[PDB]
Design a binder for this molecule. Structure first.
Ligand code: SF4
Ligand code: SF4
Ligand code: SF4
Ligand code: SF4
Ligand code: FES
Ligand code: MG
Ligand code: ZN
Lengths: 125, 230, 29, 97, 48, 176, 379, 208, 115, 96, 112
């Protein structure tokens, strides 16, 4: 009832993607960096897969922004790095993986503001 | 070792001595609301948005400044802490100007988002608001001080990171204002960063003014080449 | 001061509305 | 309707109904196209006190679904998903068309 | 206007024969009505 | 409660059978339908005399878009991009910069009228009543290009329709 | 055995006939597939609302209500009572519009074209009601997931009452044209008979069930809004053919008039959207006077409200049958998945069985009695 | 809870929980999980092998008799090893109840067709095959139902682009409609709307 | 391990048998398709197109992928034989309106930034 | 405040005009270029500065709820005048 | 005797007590071959025994329809036939056996 065939998964021939949008693309798998304008960290929880930026030009009428690559807006979400890597490999996309950046824990001390001899003593508050 | 045991919503977590309530909540994955606290700056404790209830304690404590004690059960989502958050947000919004459509920090405002997530949905403020005059600190940072919430992040950054002590507060009470008290440009190689640390549209980028909204922008993660720091 | 004014039915409600089928027999054996 | 009496009688006889009582063309019986201003009252949350949002927060009372019978972790009368539906009544207003 | 006609036929316009630059003796169209008479003619208001 | 639509049993007495036979042979119900049509011929038609007469409309009706301005003559739009954000069809394109006097104003405000669904979400998202959907609906065109409105076209539409637009807003704003 | 491809609402139909008999009927659809369900994933919930107007175009108000009910269930909120009463009133008006469209078209295809005009005058009046309440005649977007967008104008109830007290005569004229006509009965009686068991197994709903004698109606069995506060009867067929379904539809219109009367007499006062500014936008004056109202307006019109994670299947008793939405939220302000369930999909899938052993001209009658609108079927 | 909050119904919650436990007890071979949502909706997560039995049971058991198939659809979740989840919504008129049955599959594993249980499934599975590429074994005639003839790919997959890969126009040189790679005069504007500052603490995930 | 459920074929040999059967069916169908749709191509180049489409997938070594491709090809043949396709659908295999894309480095460098 | 480009085209309020060698000008031949003649910057520059004896003043653009959100403007700086961020009206304290 | 049960395709059943008794006896016979500890066997035997006892103690048809809570004794007969067919297919399927296999680690985790 089981084949037990040994080969890496490959579904490129079944997805209908054109040839030049498989081998020429370079996906990036990363945890998005926090927007520095805000302190909330809820946007840095999941992994993202996104494609490489292609040409954008000006529409001769209306001066709008025109594109020719169909994957310009494609972003996928993943729970772990391994899941995204597996998806990319089974879809035949060359990928670059960036390790997650976590802000290291810090030593905070309110009393250090009023130091007797150290430089941590603040001049205003 | 020296790790002590504390509880966040009844969940045990081991922390180093000197860890504050805010970092203890961070270790479990809960982010306490804040306006004046920054990881890279000295602790201020003035915005009172981080107030949280300790179990079997009648008074809420400031999570950003209070070191956690052994056996403490921090109740991040209790009714007392939620009411404290609503009251603090109401006070913060009482005198805030209705500038969201013209404010550059529209879709990137910690005030807006924390009002939507932790504050009330209406106002009962029937008075008139205060207005302060703007300050000129150069051609890089645009200043609209009516939007200022007096978190003092800019002052702490200028004094501690940039090494420049030209920023401060003048006056007392409701009319205390953040500025220089003299016409003077805050010009240093790190001056633009006070735009990022400011949670509101009080300090904005001047060359970037009115050009885009945050939800439109595509973010490309890249490297600077203006020097060899990378 | 001023009272509430929105679109409301008149006091006592509306008049009855016919809905039953009416297919009269003209009459001839 | 500006219809002659003879034509009204002829159309009434042809249709078999009295047309004048229920006309399909609108006339002065409709409302004026200029109306007084409204007032539009406010909802139940417009109070000045005892109105904390945490006590009327519907979205924050939603919870993840209750788990019964996770596989990874007595007489016993049989049960049905819901009680058998009661049969309908035969419309003692006009039971048959 | 004529209030004795049914709703829709109780207000009407007779178009001018010479608008800005064209002979509109035969070639009339709805866009020749100015906005105020447009509001009156479409029964958006009862006041001319 | 429920009702039966077709649960009647025909009578089988001689009189009823003869009545049904008379209907079958003399075509009675067809004559009834002819009478209904004849009665409809003699009543007043419901046709209106377009374009001399127009169909009724409401102050809430949404037509061609317009950009309004203040009574002083300065435009109301301050380039917040809320209408662009809410547009379900992505039919609005906005670009903005500080003006020569420092004002927050648009340099580009385009509406693709062939992508617009005329939902009116833009005019209700607007905080300053700058973009509205005005009463005009007779703006058909001979080419696709003239339906790609820029800021100049929308400002011209506002200056053209402001009287009626302001009257409609005065009529309907207490409901908003 | 000859094969004919009746190509291009818009429908392609490949049939094999043995003489006059229809041996096989195969509908090819997708001529109006616009990819609504994929497009919804790129919109906020408010931005996704107007697609439901275009799903089943004949009855726009009902789709709005179904979508709003699904979103409200996922949000754990409820609309105010006046909003619910307005929703039910306009749903019954919507039902009348759909029924007039279905009945007249069925008659027109059958070759009787007079009642199409007669009742499209009434359809125009109901379009006027739509436009006065929302500003649009047919693609309304009036019913929102917090209630309704705007309150009724000060003279709308009186005009609705004036319209509704004359409509029964129009239905009587339509019946005079149709119900006892021998040609109409010969065209409809004993055509497309479906058994109760087959109707249940094939996924039929609405009149397509009730024509076979199945006593089922979502407004009675699983009431939504205030349908448990109104009184009406559910017409039931006895032979499962086109004639019984036509009678059921005609009877349903009369019942809708009854419900509309009750809604008019019992319209309550109060607000029209939920008093929760994190879901429903505030009033314009509040937005221009209060800081919180302005912030909530900004956020609700830029990001939209977040819906807690979870999936629901919400169905309502639509004019064409059971209309449903399977909505999956991942916790953000954009739906993760929105599967639209259309009654016409299953009805057209059953057309093949329904047309077995009939004339070619009976296929038109069966398609007319299935009440098929292409936009909902293809999505 | 005040008028703005949806009221709860504990009676239906208890009934649905009891019936879920009942179903899980009767078919332990296939039922992997049973859940009831806070708005009283019952879902049963099963192994793919049990599609025909479980459905048959839910259709034919005297205490269940869910005789109506309201909807059958699929959901694409790329992060899962089994990419697609298959959802059956069933309605019981006898007990005025609804149930949901969930299973899973990947790109290559077929799922048993359920046309023998419900005729209504015939088109639904076809649509799934068109939109997600899930193959149904022993389907009477499986083929595309919604896309154009010769269309490549499955649009409802998450990785499928919104505008697709080809577009159509009329060419006068060949006097016919032709298909060419997509080129937009205005690119679709991607909006980043998700805010930081999480909204619902009750759905917070462990930080691992 | 790595045990998976079959679709139609247990090993590659059955898959190739199915592939050959589908190829025979397409080869037989080509002339009738050329005549019925009034195509201006020849039978030879139509069969060359069939061969090229088959050879595009020659690198597949997974029997499940192979018989899924066979299922899709059989669906395509079903569409062609029953004349559900139009002339445009058949002619889409040839890309007659697309200008050729050069492959060498210099041409790609000249036309733009796209590799 | 419409001006004229050296080529001959009207310069819009945004300051746009095709340069001399720009081919896109061909779109305006046998047709016209849509230009709004009412320049908002000039029109708002014509409004007189309001004289108010208050340190802080509120502006809503006029018309009540038909204006813009109400904002408060400080008039402590005597060198300049307070300007509304929505409407552009100017306010000033009575110096001397 | 009544006519026209009201459901298209559902014939009026004359003498329904005997048909119900035969169907319930056949159902119990089939259930006897299922293992004694299987939940389906015990539950279906309990339901069938209740229904058989209720049909044996009520000769009046309408009272039987009210007691059975299914109504229209013809569809009660139809549901009994469906239960018999399901019982045979379940004796074939053997769903009382332990679970075939667990799902992957995070197959059902939502969100993400
Ligand atoms: S700082 Fe934030 S809340 Fe204040 S006006 Fe700007 S966007 Fe609005
Ligand atoms: S200007 Fe900004 S950073 Fe400085 S105190 Fe005010 S709100 Fe804080
Ligand atoms: S009416 Fe709707 S679709 Fe049209 S521009 Fe406004 S928001 Fe966009
Ligand atoms: S038209 Fe209104 S909503 Fe749109 S950018 Fe201008 S001010 Fe903002
Ligand atoms: S964040 Fe702690 S008081 Fe401000
Ligand atoms: Mg800032
Ligand atoms: Zn102003």
């Amino acid at each position: 009832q089981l084949i037990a065939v040994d080969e890496k998964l490959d579904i490129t021939t079944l997805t209908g993607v054109p040839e030049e949008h498989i081998k020429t693309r370079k996906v990036r798998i990363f945890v998005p960096a926090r927007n520095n304008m805000q302190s909330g960290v809820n946007n840095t929880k999941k992994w993202k897969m996104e494609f490489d930026t292609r040409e954008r030009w000006e529409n001769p009428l209306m001066g709008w922004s025109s594109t020719a690559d169909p994957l310009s807006n494609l972003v996928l979400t993943f729970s772990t790095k391994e899941d995204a890597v597996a998806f990319a490999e089974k879809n035949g996309w060359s990928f670059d993986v960036e390790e997650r950046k976590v802000p290291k824990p810090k030593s905070k001390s309110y009393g250090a503001n009023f130091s007797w001899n150290k430089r941590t003593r603040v001049s205003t508050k | 070792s020296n790790l002590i045991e504390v509880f966040v919503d009844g969940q045990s977590v081991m922390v180093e001595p000197g860890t504050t309530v805010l970092q203890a909540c961070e270790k479990v994955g809960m982010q306490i609301p804040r306006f004046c606290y920054h990881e890279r700056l000295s602790v201020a404790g003035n915005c009172r948005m981080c107030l949280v209830e300790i179990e079997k304690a009648p008074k809420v404590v400031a999570a950003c400044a209070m070191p956690v004690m052994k056996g403490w059960n921090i109740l991040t989502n209790s009714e007392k802490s939620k009411k404290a958050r609503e009251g603090v947000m109401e006070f913060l919004l009482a005198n805030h100007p209705l500038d969201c459509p013209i404010c550059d920090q529209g879709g990137e405002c910690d005030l807006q988002d924390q009002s939507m997530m932790f504050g009330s949905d209406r106002s009962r403020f029937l008075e008139g608001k205060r207005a302060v005059e703007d300050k000129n600190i150069g051609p890089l940072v645009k200043t609209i001080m009516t939007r200022c919430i007096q978190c003092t992040r800019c002052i702490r950054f200028a004094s501690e990171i940039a090494g420049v002590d030209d920023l401060g507060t003048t006056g007392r009470g409701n009319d205390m204002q953040v500025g220089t008290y003299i016409e003077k440009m805050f010009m240093s190689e790190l001056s633009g960063n006070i735009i990022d640390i400011c949670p509101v549209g009080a300090l904005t980028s001047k060359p970037y003014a009115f050009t885009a909204r945050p939800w439109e922008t595509r973010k490309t993660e890249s490297i600077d080449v203006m020097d060899a720091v990378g | 001061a001023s009272k509430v004014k929105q679109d409301m039915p008149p006091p006592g409600g509306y008049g009855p509305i016919d809905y039953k089928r009416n297919l009269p027999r003209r009459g001839l054996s | 309707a500006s219809a002659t009496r003879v034509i009204q009688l002829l159309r009434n006889w042809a249709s078999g109904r009295d047309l004048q009582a229920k006309l399909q063309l609108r006339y002065q019986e409709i409302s004026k196209r200029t109306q007084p201003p409204p007032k539009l009252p406010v909802g139940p949350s417009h109070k000045l006190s005892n109105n904390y949002y945490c006590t009327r927060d519907g979205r924050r009372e939603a919870m993840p679904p209750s788990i019964v019978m996770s596989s990874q972790k007595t007489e016993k009368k049989a049960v049905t998903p819901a009680p058998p539906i009661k049969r309908w009544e035969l419309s003692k207003d006009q039971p048959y068309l | 206007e004529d209030n004795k006609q049914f709703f829709g036929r109780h207000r009407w316009v007779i178009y001018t024969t010479e608008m800005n630059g064209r002979d509109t003796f035969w070639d009339v169209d709805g866009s020749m009505v100015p906005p105020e008479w447009h509001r009156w003619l479409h029964c958006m208001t009862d006041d001319p | 409660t429920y009702k039966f639509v077709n649960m009647r049993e025909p009578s089988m007495d001689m009189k009823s059978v003869t009545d049904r036979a008379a209907q079958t042979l003399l075509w009675t119900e067809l004559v009834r339908g002819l009478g209904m049509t004849l009665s409809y011929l003699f009543r007043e038609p419901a046709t209106i005399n377009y374009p001399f007469e127009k169909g009724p409309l409401s102050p809430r009706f949404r037509g061609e878009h317009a950009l309004r301005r203040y009574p002083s003559g300065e435009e109301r739009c301050i380039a917040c991009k809320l209408c662009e954000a809410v547009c379900p069809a992505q039919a609005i394109t906005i670009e903005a910069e500080p003006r020569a006097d420092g004002s927050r104003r648009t340099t580009r405000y385009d509406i693709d009228m062939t992508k617009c669904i005329y939902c009116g979400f833009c005019q209700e998202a607007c905080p300053v009543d700058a973009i509205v959907e005005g009463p005009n609906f007779e703006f058909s065109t001979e080419t696709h290009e003239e339906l790609l409105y820029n800021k100049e076209k929308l400002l011209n539409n506002g200056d053209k329709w402001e009287a009626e637009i302001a009257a409609n807003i005065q009529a309907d704003y207490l409901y908003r | 055995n000859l094969t004919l491809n009746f190509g291009p609402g818009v429908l392609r139909l490949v049939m094999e006939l043995s003489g006059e008999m229809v041996r096989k009927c195969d509908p090819h659809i997708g001529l109006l597939h616009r990819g609504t369900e994929k497009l919804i994933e790129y919109k906020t919930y408010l931005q996704a609302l107007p697609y439901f107007d275009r799903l089943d175009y004949v009855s726009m108000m009902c789709n709005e209500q179904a979508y709003s009910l699904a979103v409200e269930k996922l949000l754990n909120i409820q609309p105010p009572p006046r909003a619910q009463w307005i929703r039910v009133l306009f749903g019954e008006i919507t039902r009348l519009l759909n029924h007039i469209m279905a009945v007249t078209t069925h008659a027109l295809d059958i070759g009787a074209m007079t009642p199409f005009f007669w009742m499209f005058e009434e359809r125009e009046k109901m379009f006027e009601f739509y436009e006065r309440v929302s500003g649009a005649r047919m693609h309304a977007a009036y019913i929102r997931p917090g209630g309704v967008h705007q309150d009724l104008p000060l003279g709308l109830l009186d005009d609705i009452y004036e319209f509704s007290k004359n409509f029964s005569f129009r239905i009587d004229e339509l019946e005079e044209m149709l119900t006892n006509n021998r040609i109409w009965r010969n065209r409809t009686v004993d055509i497309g008979v479906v058994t109760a068991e087959d109707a249940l197994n094939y996924g039929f709903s609405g009149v397509m069930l009730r024509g076979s004698g199945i006593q089922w109606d979502l407004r009675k069995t699983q009431p939504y809004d205030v349908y448990d506060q109104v009184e009406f009867d559910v017409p039931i067929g006895s032979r499962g053919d086109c004639y019984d379904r036509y009678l059921c539809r005609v009877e349903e219109m009369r019942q809708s008039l009854r419900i509309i009367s009750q809604c008019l007499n019992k319209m309550p006062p109060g607000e029209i959207k939920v008093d929760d500014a994190k879901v429903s936008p505030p009033k314009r004056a509040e937005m221009k006077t209060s800081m919180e109202s302005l912030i909530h307006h900004f956020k609700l019109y830029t990001e939209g409200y977040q819906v807690p994670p979870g999936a629901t299947y919400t169905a309502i008793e639509a004019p064409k049958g059971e209309f449903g939405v399977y909505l999956v939220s991942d916790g953000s302000s954009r739906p993760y998945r929105c599967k639209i369930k259309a009654p016409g999909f299953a009805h057209l899938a059953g057309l093949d069985k329904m047309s077995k052993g009939h004339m070619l001209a009976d296929v038109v009658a069966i398609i007319g009695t299935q009440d098929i609108v292409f936009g909902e079927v293809d999505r | 809870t005040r008028p703005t909050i949806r009221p709860r119904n504990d009676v239906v919650h208890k009934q649905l929980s009891a019936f879920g436990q009942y179903v899980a007890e009767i078919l332990p071979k296939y039922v992997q999980q049973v859940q009831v949502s806070c708005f009283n909706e019952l879902e049963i997560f099963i192994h793919p092998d049990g599609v025909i039995p479980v459905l048959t049971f839910l259709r034919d058991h005297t205490n269940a008799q869910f005789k109506s198939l309201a909807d059958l659809t699929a959901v694409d979740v790329p992060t899962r090893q089994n990419r697609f989840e298959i959802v059956y919504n069933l309605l019981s008129l006898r007990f005025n109840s609804r149930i949901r049955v969930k299973t899973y599959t990947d790109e290559l594993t077929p799922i048993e067709s359920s046309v023998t249980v419900y005729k209504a499934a015939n088109w639904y599975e076809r649509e799934i095959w068109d939109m997600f590429g899930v193959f149904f074994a022993n389907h009477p005639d499986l083929r595309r139902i919604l896309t154009d003839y010769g269309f490549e790919g499955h649009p409802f997959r998450k990785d499928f682009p919104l505008s697709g890969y080809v577009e159509l126009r009329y060419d006068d040189e060949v006097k016919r409609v032709v298909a060419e790679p997509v080129e937009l005069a205005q690119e679709f504007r991607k909006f980043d709307l998700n805010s930081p500052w999480e909204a619902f603490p009750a759905y917070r995930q462990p930080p691992e | 391990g790595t045990s998976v459920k079959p679709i139609f074929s247990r090993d590659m040999n059955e898959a190739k048998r199915r592939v050959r059967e589908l190829y025979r069916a397409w080869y037989r169908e080509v002339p009738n398709t050329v005549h019925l749709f009034q195509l201006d191509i020849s039978v030879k180049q139509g069969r060359d197109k069939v061969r090229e489409m088959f050879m595009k997938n020659a690198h597949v070594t997974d029997p499940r992928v192979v018989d899924l491709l066979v299922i899709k090809g059989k669906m395509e043949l079903e569409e062609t034989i029953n004349v559900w396709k139009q002339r445009t659908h058949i002619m889409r295999f040839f890309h007659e309106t697309e200008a050729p894309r050069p492959t060498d480095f210099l041409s790609k460098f000249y036309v733009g930034h796209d590799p | 405040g419409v001006r004229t480009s050296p080529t001959g085209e009207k310069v819009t309020h945004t300051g746009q005009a095709y340069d001399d060698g720009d081919y896109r000008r061909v779109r305006f031949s046998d047709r016209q270029k849509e230009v709004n003649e009412n320049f908002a910057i000039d029109l708002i520059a014509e409004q007189p500065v309001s004289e108010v004896g208050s340190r802080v003043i509120s502006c809503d653009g006029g018309g009540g709820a038909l204006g813009h959100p109400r904002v408060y403007i400080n008039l402590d700086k005597e060198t300049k005048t307070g300007t509304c961020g929505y409407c552009g009206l100017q306010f000033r304290q009575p110096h001397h | 005797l009544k006519k026209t049960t009201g459901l298209v395709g559902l014939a009026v059943c004359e003498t329904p007590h005997e048909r119900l008794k035969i169907l319930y006896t056949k159902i119990l016979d089939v259930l006897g071959q299922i293992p004694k500890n299987a939940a389906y066997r015990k539950y279906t035997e309990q339901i069938t025994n209740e229904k058989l006892g209720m049909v044996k103690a009520e000769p009046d048809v309408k009272k039987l329809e009210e007691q059975l809570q299914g109504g229209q004794i013809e569809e009660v007969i139809l549901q009994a036939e469906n239960e018999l067919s399901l019982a045979r297919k379940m004796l074939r399927w053997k769903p009382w056996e332990p679970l075939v296999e667990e799902p992957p680690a995070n197959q059902w985790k939502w969100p993400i």
